[PDB]
Amino acid sequence: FYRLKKIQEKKKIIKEKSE
Amino acid sequence: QAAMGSQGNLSAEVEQATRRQVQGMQSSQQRNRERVLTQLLGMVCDVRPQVHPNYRI
Amino acid sequence: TFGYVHGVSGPVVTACDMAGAAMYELVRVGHSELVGEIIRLEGDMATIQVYEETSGVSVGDPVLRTGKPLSVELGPGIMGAIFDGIQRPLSDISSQTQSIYIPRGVNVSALSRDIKWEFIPSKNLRVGSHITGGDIYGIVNENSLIKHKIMLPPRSRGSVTYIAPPGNYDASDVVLELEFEGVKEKLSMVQVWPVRQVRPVTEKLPANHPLLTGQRVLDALFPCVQGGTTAIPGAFGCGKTVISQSLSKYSNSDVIIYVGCGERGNEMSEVLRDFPELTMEVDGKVESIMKRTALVANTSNMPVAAREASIYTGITLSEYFRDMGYHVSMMADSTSRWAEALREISGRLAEMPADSGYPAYLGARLASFYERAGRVKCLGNPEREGSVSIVGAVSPPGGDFSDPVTSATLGIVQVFWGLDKKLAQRKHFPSVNWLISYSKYMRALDEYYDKHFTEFVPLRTKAKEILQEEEDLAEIVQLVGKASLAETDKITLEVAKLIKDDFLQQNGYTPYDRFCPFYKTVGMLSNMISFYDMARRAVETTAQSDNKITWSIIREHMGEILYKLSSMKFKDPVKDGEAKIKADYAQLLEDMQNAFRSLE
Amino acid sequence: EKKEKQIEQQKKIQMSNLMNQARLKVLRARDDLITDLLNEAKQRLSKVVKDTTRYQVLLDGLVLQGLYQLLEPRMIVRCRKQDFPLVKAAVQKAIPMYKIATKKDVDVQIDLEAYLPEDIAGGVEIYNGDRKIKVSNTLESRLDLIAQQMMPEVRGALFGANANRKFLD
Amino acid sequence: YLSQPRLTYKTVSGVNGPLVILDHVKFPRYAEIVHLTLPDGTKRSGQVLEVSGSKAVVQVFEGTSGIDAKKTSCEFTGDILRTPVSEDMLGRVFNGSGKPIDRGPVVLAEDFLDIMGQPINPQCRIYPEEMIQTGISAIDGMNSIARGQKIPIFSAAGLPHNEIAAQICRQAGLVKKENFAIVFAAMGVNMETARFFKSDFEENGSMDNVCLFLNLANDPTIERIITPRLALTTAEFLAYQCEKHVLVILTDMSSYAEALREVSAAREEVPGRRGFPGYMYTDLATIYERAGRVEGRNGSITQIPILTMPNDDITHPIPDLTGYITEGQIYVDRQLHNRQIYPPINVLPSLSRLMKSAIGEGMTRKDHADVSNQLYACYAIGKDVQAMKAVVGEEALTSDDLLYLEFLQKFEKNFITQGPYENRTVYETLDIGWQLLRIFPKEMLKRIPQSTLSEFYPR
Amino acid sequence: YLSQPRLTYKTVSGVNGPLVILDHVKFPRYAEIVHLTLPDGTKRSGQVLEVSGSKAVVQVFEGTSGIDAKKTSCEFTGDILRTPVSEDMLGRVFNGSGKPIDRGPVVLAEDFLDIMGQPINPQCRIYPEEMIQTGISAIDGMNSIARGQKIPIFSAAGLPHNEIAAQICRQAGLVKKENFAIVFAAMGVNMETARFFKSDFEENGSMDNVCLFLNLANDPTIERIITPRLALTTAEFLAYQCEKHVLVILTDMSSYAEALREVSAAREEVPGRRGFPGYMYTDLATIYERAGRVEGRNGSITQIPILTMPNDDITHPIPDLTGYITEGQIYVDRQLHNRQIYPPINVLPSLSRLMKSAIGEGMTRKDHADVSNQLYACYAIGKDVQAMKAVVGEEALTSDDLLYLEFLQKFEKNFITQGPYENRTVYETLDIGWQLLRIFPKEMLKRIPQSTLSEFYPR
Amino acid sequence: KDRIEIFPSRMAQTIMKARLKGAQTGRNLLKKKSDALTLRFRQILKK
Amino acid sequence: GIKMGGLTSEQYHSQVVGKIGYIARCMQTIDPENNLKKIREDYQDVLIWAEKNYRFEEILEASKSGKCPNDLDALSRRSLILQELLRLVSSISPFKMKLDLIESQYEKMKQHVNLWKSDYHVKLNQLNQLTDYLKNAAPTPKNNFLRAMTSVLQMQIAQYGITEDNEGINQLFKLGLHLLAMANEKIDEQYHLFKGYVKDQPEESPFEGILP
């Protein structure tokens, strides 16, 4: 769970940077 | 009954000892109050402007 | 006071232009006014958790911001009504719509504004007088049982500028106006209090007065105290109805609150159908239980926010009446269902799970929930007192005690009324396990028992010793058959049976045994133990040599006395008054002691 | 024996309550003495404020001091109206200095619509352009800000040092 | 009605697995239904799962292969998924999307209902009363289904849970001491079983009272999620608006749960316990609790969810979360199946919490409650004696033990073993009970009051 | 001192759980305290747990319910939570935030100490070489307490760990044949527990030497992880600046760990076991290691950080990581309590790391170490014999085994059982030891040399 | 000693649960053997 | 977070202002002619703040500054004593109590260790139970018996008070409460119970001069 949550947050950060 | 009277007057001594300590405390601070006011007021009046140590340029 | 919907990702709605909003505020999202709360905030945008289905919500929909956080509306009309976990009247929603469904975005005021209540001022206050929080400035006459005392909301005070005269007012009128530092506040009969906030009291007092339930077992052996907290197992076959009915019907408390958390639809129906049919004698008249009861109903398919909030809505309603000086007894039908709702929300919010998947703060929430119970000295100048008791049930998956919810609960509650199913299968009711059950209030009640009854305390100690010894002897009996067994042990076994049969067992479907007054409970136990002591002496004082007394001799010799002891439960308090029943028990003791005397 | 235990327990437990309340009583009296000093200090500061020739000097510093803490391109100086002529001077003499100490051009305005309450002994508060960041440099704020840190020395200066303290770690 | 012309967009920001991300969409709704037209003229359906500003994200029901970001057009309906319902749809067979697959016409609607619906107001919920007989003795004389309860069938993989489900559809009805319908939904069903259900209902004349929804294993996985919602939406229309009693059978809820897990992944949600969504509890309750009786109306809905236990472990979240919010269980075993007993239902671990209200005078027969309790005790004892026999031998048994072994053998052969085409009404099931109970002399039937024995035991 | 005015901000960027994120902050300082006012006038405080550029993340102690985004006003104190401390804090009652709740005034500081404290230079730390007489044979004999030792009591919900701690507070003396200042951190407990201790301290007539910090079950969960530091900070002042011997008792440390776990989850930190932060050990060391004597100063701090073991699991991270940091534990259990044995102290799984230095010639009596070790051997073997006899039966035992059952039975009722007000000396405890050890012949007392047996065994 | 020392796995859960069921079944069957022997023993005792 | 008991800083002093005004109101309500001089003196420190308009805010400042008797526990006990005396005379309002007896009852209550748990409090609660019931009661034998017996109970309390225990009043309390709890459907039992009282009453005409 921890690793998957952090993966989802890192994806969110990448998405924000792309905007 | 004897114990209640003792507790009563023991309380009276407590009250009397407290009054002694309170008046002694007031007597003591009256000798320093003026000196402390001078020291504290000077620190308030002395502004000492300064720029944050980490300000660059 | 409006913002706009920026986007929907499921049950989570993102709002924009919503800068002026606080965390855990309330919003009504969309044209259907869906109920939700604000959790995360960033800039002028807010993240809203919507309780109901979000299907149909559009980008650009309005969001109406409501200044109050999740709160309970408190005022006249609360009694006799059934509420949702977030304080929505189910009896009005079903009757104002003619539907069978709870409408999506339903918006029915918690307390109707079309009722003209009979309000009488305190008659002690005058314009220009000083009033503070918790003060009572008038009473509303709801029904024959509970007077609804109108208190100044907490965290408010000042000088009174207007007092409404006695008359008929609804919940939308102005009853009292007060001014504090030039600021005028106009108050109706209804106050609002955030459900997650604890209503302040002057002081929290020790609980010393017993909770006088109608059962001999769960009183004599395992006392509960007004203001105390207990736990009750909730299994299909455990017979939990007996406690629920006995506590709500015959308790010495003033107000009963029954809280559902998230049970099966048919189980909620049984509770909602049973309660309106319960009555009790009060002033010689038979009155409906619903005149001094309030009920919160939540089924497993209700919004998870309501199932999680239900437990706090219930206790908030309880504290509201606690502040009136009433003794309130709240039952949570299943705190396991609440914990399930809490875990669901934690999961939905992608919070890090802890023990067996439950939130890290599970224990903190249960501890702070139960801490809100207790006997208190109320706010306000009337110097009144009251209490809240909690008898919340636990029903962990599998019936195990390892589940963090039941384990945490047992470490918090001071009384555990452990029930069993085996006893129910044997038709022994109430189904109390005895060896698992405990009460940690025994010391707190020693002052009450000493003052009013004196002999109760050593009797309950001996009663537990006799019952425990019967269990301890079980292995000896199994391997022996009562052959190589002391006569003193035979007395213990047979007397323990008498206790189990004609004392701890109680038949609530008989008119004479509906309610056992305390004086009868201690009367019955006193005579049974007095017999035990006499029987032990009859054997032991003669057991030396030559001519000894045995249990077979005692049982055959005074069989009428053993019968009379069993017959004691049939002394109907409704027809045979306190003096007559005590007199008959006193005569039994004399007949009993004299029967033993003939053996020496 | 039980009775004796009850009476003996009350005799100890009642005297404990009495001694505990006596301790609280003298502690409250000590705090009253500290408050009287601070209330006198407030009145003494007011008397200083009434002296234009020293109060203007305080304002000169107090305005510049706040400016250095914000380091914003736009400043709004808020004061009680009575002292506006002196705050005006304090700002005028503060900007040449600000532009030297920080090497940043700052637009400093005085708010002529919003004023501090008339019961403030003196001093200024300075806001940034959007009024989201403010520094409070009035005489009451300074008195408490310093007094709360000097209190350990006031305690000793008025009532004596604690004879049982040997180390300052 | 809306009477607002639909907008069709060709603006696509990208496509990612089952999702198509659109751009410049005007005031999109969540859960909005849209239709895609691909460059090859192929049409697909989908539903909007996220609306972040003008960037609507739609999940396509069918596969997304062939979809580009330049020519594919997306037509918005302006509304959410609302199912056309009528009485006439009873006797029809539909797929998961609600489309006919029986060569009949599209449903001619009497109304349109949101398939998500609303919870039933508890204040108007009526506790279950009369019984709905199933025709299967193992669950009529032992664990009856009250007219309003929700009692699941837990089975291991490989057991004939679908054949029993079909048998219930053919045999179930009212006690009859014309107003009864069955709505049957199969989620994730394979082609061979889908044929079985469709043909078995048609051939035996039962179809007139069955509304059948088939969601096949190779059908869109999102359609599997609405499938039970369409079945329940129909059940609610038929039951509560048309004053009749509806039995709803939801087959293979485990396959539903798997499709739900897929939807959660599509939303990029972090999986919960054992990979399943943290909201699986409320989702199952949303389905299950849309049932029961309501005040002031003569209709009712019952449910018999049927669930495959992964690795035959009742602890698994699927049967665990279901059982936690249902009233008892039927429980199909494996040993009885391997012994070639049909139906293979084990009465010892099963339970129907509402049986107390389902049966009795005025609902079935006076002796119903007494026969059930005595049969349970006799079966439990017979199994206990059989276990003893394996240790002590036949010669070490007494006469009473031999009677219990005779009961055990004849109970399973006469009472439990039935066959798929023998319909045993509640009164014949009880009569069979007595035939087995009359093996014992009266004094051994400890759980039957003497008044009942004197009336029913002889003859 | 800090003469510069503090800045006030209305620049809150956003709120996420218990963390309020500010932007536009001038030179943020790490681990500085922020005071904030809500739109309704409520005042709350928090600590900066992260700084980056112009941003700072503030963890609010009271909570984040009601925190606004536009009207919230925050000011930065400009320092870390340094707290006022004075000698006359003894006899006062404070809350978990450091404020008085006894209707007395605020603390009139003699200085301001950093709540985080500083590590004591191991070269100046002096190894404890004095024993405290607890009066409890179960401790003074087999698990002695040194002055400066860290000894928690491992307990379980419902056990009388509060009574044992209360007892220790009154009858804790020296074996030099003394008034300890007690600092009691009552955190995560109900009113009755806090009132129990408060009343006991007054009943003991020692309240003028007791400082209480209360943080009850209905108080904020974030303050529960500074309360121990507030207690210890005061203890450090008293012990190391005023040379007062201090006894610090921290109530159920598990409420500290659970409060910390909530913070760890909120900040998305790396978990270790059972969801607790991977740095739980380091955080506990910050609390526990504030103990012991310091060379050249006549003060000391002794700790008793009692903790509740979740589900009696001795391997739970809370007792586990504590066991790694503290000098052993007392450990009570349910097997003794369920038999009405008080104090219910089970010596077998217990130890005292500083006990070996504490016993013997010049400290207590020269045979101390020998008596303790042999009692451990005989007690443990008796437990092993019970494990055997439970299966094989009494008839399978020989005289060598029955002697250990005789010892085990006499040991628990003579050595462990005492009563809440039974105060035994360390010398009496050893004498009892010998009375029990003399149950066995010399040849079986294999942990004791003949140079000791020949003197003590004959009596 | 304290545990069978099988590495945690879903396979271990299946094996341990089957092992537990086997042990419980054996316990019950042997208990019945003991009861049968005890009754016969006491009967022999009566004769 | 001063959290003095269950109250914060503002709540503590707000409750003190309330209790002070309340005592002033109770004193004027119980003794509008100011005849009970000894009782008034015991409260002079809180009555001195009466007959002044402080708009709450100035009396609140006096409490914060320490000019008012702002000890919350002393006010709680002293306020309870006064309002329980008010209940004593209020619940028997149809009759006048002698001023000397009011002062006697006051002193005996004031001397009690824990008045709330006293027999005096319980007896007053039983009296209010009996007198509140009759406020809105239909004509019927039961309620006529209860009203006749209640008027005697009020008459006797007006003469003996509550602290001065009297078997006659105590027996009447028991009989009144037992009648009140008597089933409304049962007529014979309530009839015989009432007549039992009337014939056992020491006097010959128990209600003569007691009720209209």
PDB file of C-alpha atoms in Angstrom, chain E residues 18-130:
ATOM      1  CA  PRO E  18     -10.362   1.853 -21.371  1.00  0.00           C
ATOM      2  CA  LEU E  19     -10.504   5.629 -21.007  1.00  0.00           C
ATOM      3  CA  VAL E  20     -10.845   8.358 -23.626  1.00  0.00           C
ATOM      4  CA  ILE E  21      -9.890  11.848 -22.455  1.00  0.00           C
ATOM      5  CA  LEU E  22     -11.850  14.591 -24.194  1.00  0.00           C
ATOM      6  CA  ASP E  23     -11.272  18.349 -24.323  1.00  0.00           C
ATOM      7  CA  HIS E  24     -13.318  21.572 -24.570  1.00  0.00           C
ATOM      8  CA  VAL E  25     -16.474  19.847 -23.293  1.00  0.00           C
ATOM      9  CA  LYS E  26     -19.301  22.178 -22.238  1.00  0.00           C
ATOM     10  CA  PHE E  27     -20.628  21.708 -18.683  1.00  0.00           C
ATOM     11  CA  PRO E  28     -20.090  17.924 -18.622  1.00  0.00           C
ATOM     12  CA  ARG E  29     -21.819  15.780 -16.033  1.00  0.00           C
ATOM     13  CA  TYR E  30     -20.359  12.965 -13.993  1.00  0.00           C
ATOM     14  CA  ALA E  31     -21.841   9.577 -14.929  1.00  0.00           C
ATOM     15  CA  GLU E  32     -23.106  11.078 -18.202  1.00  0.00           C
ATOM     16  CA  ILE E  33     -23.718   8.600 -21.006  1.00  0.00           C
ATOM     17  CA  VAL E  34     -22.027   9.357 -24.325  1.00  0.00           C
ATOM     18  CA  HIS E  35     -21.761   7.511 -27.638  1.00  0.00           C
ATOM     19  CA  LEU E  36     -18.640   7.195 -29.764  1.00  0.00           C
ATOM     20  CA  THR E  37     -18.436   6.932 -33.534  1.00  0.00           C
ATOM     21  CA  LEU E  38     -15.125   5.541 -34.775  1.00  0.00           C
ATOM     22  CA  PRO E  39     -13.581   6.268 -38.192  1.00  0.00           C
ATOM     23  CA  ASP E  40     -14.820   2.890 -39.445  1.00  0.00           C
ATOM     24  CA  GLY E  41     -18.413   3.756 -38.577  1.00  0.00           C
ATOM     25  CA  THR E  42     -18.273   1.524 -35.525  1.00  0.00           C
ATOM     26  CA  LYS E  43     -20.324   2.804 -32.598  1.00  0.00           C
ATOM     27  CA  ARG E  44     -19.440   2.304 -28.943  1.00  0.00           C
ATOM     28  CA  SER E  45     -21.002   3.329 -25.653  1.00  0.00           C
ATOM     29  CA  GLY E  46     -19.321   4.841 -22.643  1.00  0.00           C
ATOM     30  CA  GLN E  47     -19.800   6.712 -19.414  1.00  0.00           C
ATOM     31  CA  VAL E  48     -18.112   9.807 -18.033  1.00  0.00           C
ATOM     32  CA  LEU E  49     -16.064   8.899 -14.952  1.00  0.00           C
ATOM     33  CA  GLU E  50     -14.223  12.161 -14.262  1.00  0.00           C
ATOM     34  CA  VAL E  51     -14.936  15.747 -15.243  1.00  0.00           C
ATOM     35  CA  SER E  52     -11.971  18.000 -14.430  1.00  0.00           C
ATOM     36  CA  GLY E  53     -12.964  21.342 -15.873  1.00  0.00           C
ATOM     37  CA  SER E  54     -13.431  20.973 -19.621  1.00  0.00           C
ATOM     38  CA  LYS E  55     -11.464  17.689 -19.662  1.00  0.00           C
ATOM     39  CA  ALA E  56     -14.117  14.981 -19.449  1.00  0.00           C
ATOM     40  CA  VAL E  57     -12.845  11.412 -19.106  1.00  0.00           C
ATOM     41  CA  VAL E  58     -15.114   8.705 -20.457  1.00  0.00           C
ATOM     42  CA  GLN E  59     -14.790   4.963 -19.932  1.00  0.00           C
ATOM     43  CA  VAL E  60     -15.723   3.046 -23.067  1.00  0.00           C
ATOM     44  CA  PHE E  61     -17.847  -0.028 -22.483  1.00  0.00           C
ATOM     45  CA  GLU E  62     -16.411  -1.984 -25.400  1.00  0.00           C
ATOM     46  CA  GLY E  63     -12.732  -2.107 -26.259  1.00  0.00           C
ATOM     47  CA  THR E  64     -10.997   1.136 -27.159  1.00  0.00           C
ATOM     48  CA  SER E  65      -9.011  -0.367 -30.056  1.00  0.00           C
ATOM     49  CA  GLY E  66      -9.312   1.641 -33.253  1.00  0.00           C
ATOM     50  CA  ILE E  67     -10.027   4.912 -31.477  1.00  0.00           C
ATOM     51  CA  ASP E  68      -7.850   7.829 -32.560  1.00  0.00           C
ATOM     52  CA  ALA E  69      -7.484  11.401 -31.360  1.00  0.00           C
ATOM     53  CA  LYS E  70      -8.367  13.085 -34.670  1.00  0.00           C
ATOM     54  CA  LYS E  71     -11.581  11.720 -36.200  1.00  0.00           C
ATOM     55  CA  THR E  72     -13.462   9.817 -33.485  1.00  0.00           C
ATOM     56  CA  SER E  73     -16.557  11.761 -32.448  1.00  0.00           C
ATOM     57  CA  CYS E  74     -18.246  11.676 -29.036  1.00  0.00           C
ATOM     58  CA  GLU E  75     -21.962  12.462 -28.776  1.00  0.00           C
ATOM     59  CA  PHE E  76     -23.195  13.581 -25.366  1.00  0.00           C
ATOM     60  CA  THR E  77     -26.739  12.754 -24.292  1.00  0.00           C
ATOM     61  CA  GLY E  78     -26.941  15.364 -21.551  1.00  0.00           C
ATOM     62  CA  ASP E  79     -28.217  12.819 -19.039  1.00  0.00           C
ATOM     63  CA  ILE E  80     -27.188   9.813 -16.965  1.00  0.00           C
ATOM     64  CA  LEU E  81     -28.014   6.121 -17.352  1.00  0.00           C
ATOM     65  CA  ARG E  82     -31.749   5.644 -16.820  1.00  0.00           C
ATOM     66  CA  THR E  83     -33.335   2.343 -17.511  1.00  0.00           C
ATOM     67  CA  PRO E  84     -36.653   1.979 -19.346  1.00  0.00           C
ATOM     68  CA  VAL E  85     -38.892  -0.151 -17.149  1.00  0.00           C
ATOM     69  CA  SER E  86     -42.301  -1.706 -17.707  1.00  0.00           C
ATOM     70  CA  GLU E  87     -44.308  -4.727 -16.685  1.00  0.00           C
ATOM     71  CA  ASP E  88     -44.001  -6.071 -20.237  1.00  0.00           C
ATOM     72  CA  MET E  89     -40.247  -6.624 -19.845  1.00  0.00           C
ATOM     73  CA  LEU E  90     -41.111  -9.597 -17.634  1.00  0.00           C
ATOM     74  CA  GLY E  91     -40.665 -12.592 -19.879  1.00  0.00           C
ATOM     75  CA  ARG E  92     -37.809 -10.931 -21.730  1.00  0.00           C
ATOM     76  CA  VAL E  93     -34.096 -11.678 -21.746  1.00  0.00           C
ATOM     77  CA  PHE E  94     -31.619  -8.796 -21.731  1.00  0.00           C
ATOM     78  CA  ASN E  95     -27.867  -8.350 -21.759  1.00  0.00           C
ATOM     79  CA  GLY E  96     -25.972  -6.324 -19.167  1.00  0.00           C
ATOM     80  CA  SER E  97     -26.617  -3.026 -20.939  1.00  0.00           C
ATOM     81  CA  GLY E  98     -30.384  -3.554 -20.910  1.00  0.00           C
ATOM     82  CA  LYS E  99     -30.658  -4.426 -24.588  1.00  0.00           C
ATOM     83  CA  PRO E 100     -32.827  -7.381 -25.677  1.00  0.00           C
ATOM     84  CA  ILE E 101     -31.047 -10.537 -26.804  1.00  0.00           C
ATOM     85  CA  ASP E 102     -34.201 -12.608 -27.333  1.00  0.00           C
ATOM     86  CA  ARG E 103     -34.982 -11.285 -30.837  1.00  0.00           C
ATOM     87  CA  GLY E 104     -37.816  -9.216 -29.387  1.00  0.00           C
ATOM     88  CA  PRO E 105     -38.277  -5.462 -29.606  1.00  0.00           C
ATOM     89  CA  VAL E 106     -36.691  -2.802 -27.452  1.00  0.00           C
ATOM     90  CA  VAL E 107     -38.627  -2.278 -24.232  1.00  0.00           C
ATOM     91  CA  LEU E 108     -41.573   0.065 -24.651  1.00  0.00           C
ATOM     92  CA  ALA E 109     -41.087   1.994 -21.439  1.00  0.00           C
ATOM     93  CA  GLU E 110     -43.625   2.892 -18.794  1.00  0.00           C
ATOM     94  CA  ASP E 111     -41.048   5.057 -17.036  1.00  0.00           C
ATOM     95  CA  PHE E 112     -37.342   5.794 -16.691  1.00  0.00           C
ATOM     96  CA  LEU E 113     -35.534   5.216 -13.395  1.00  0.00           C
ATOM     97  CA  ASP E 114     -32.025   6.095 -12.302  1.00  0.00           C
ATOM     98  CA  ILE E 115     -30.418   2.704 -11.849  1.00  0.00           C
ATOM     99  CA  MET E 116     -28.512   3.874  -8.769  1.00  0.00           C
ATOM    100  CA  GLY E 117     -31.814   4.822  -7.139  1.00  0.00           C
ATOM    101  CA  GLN E 118     -32.103   5.748  -3.482  1.00  0.00           C
ATOM    102  CA  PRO E 119     -32.058   3.866  -0.173  1.00  0.00           C
ATOM    103  CA  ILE E 120     -35.419   2.827   1.213  1.00  0.00           C
ATOM    104  CA  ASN E 121     -36.451   5.044   4.119  1.00  0.00           C
ATOM    105  CA  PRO E 122     -36.052   2.817   7.209  1.00  0.00           C
ATOM    106  CA  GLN E 123     -39.068   4.417   8.879  1.00  0.00           C
ATOM    107  CA  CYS E 124     -41.323   2.717   6.327  1.00  0.00           C
ATOM    108  CA  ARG E 125     -39.571  -0.652   6.213  1.00  0.00           C
ATOM    109  CA  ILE E 126     -41.745  -3.561   7.320  1.00  0.00           C
ATOM    110  CA  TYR E 127     -40.236  -6.585   9.089  1.00  0.00           C
ATOM    111  CA  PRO E 128     -40.517  -9.741   6.744  1.00  0.00           C
ATOM    112  CA  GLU E 129     -43.534 -11.981   7.334  1.00  0.00           C
ATOM    113  CA  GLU E 130     -44.849 -14.766   5.108  1.00  0.00           C
TER     114      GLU E 130
END
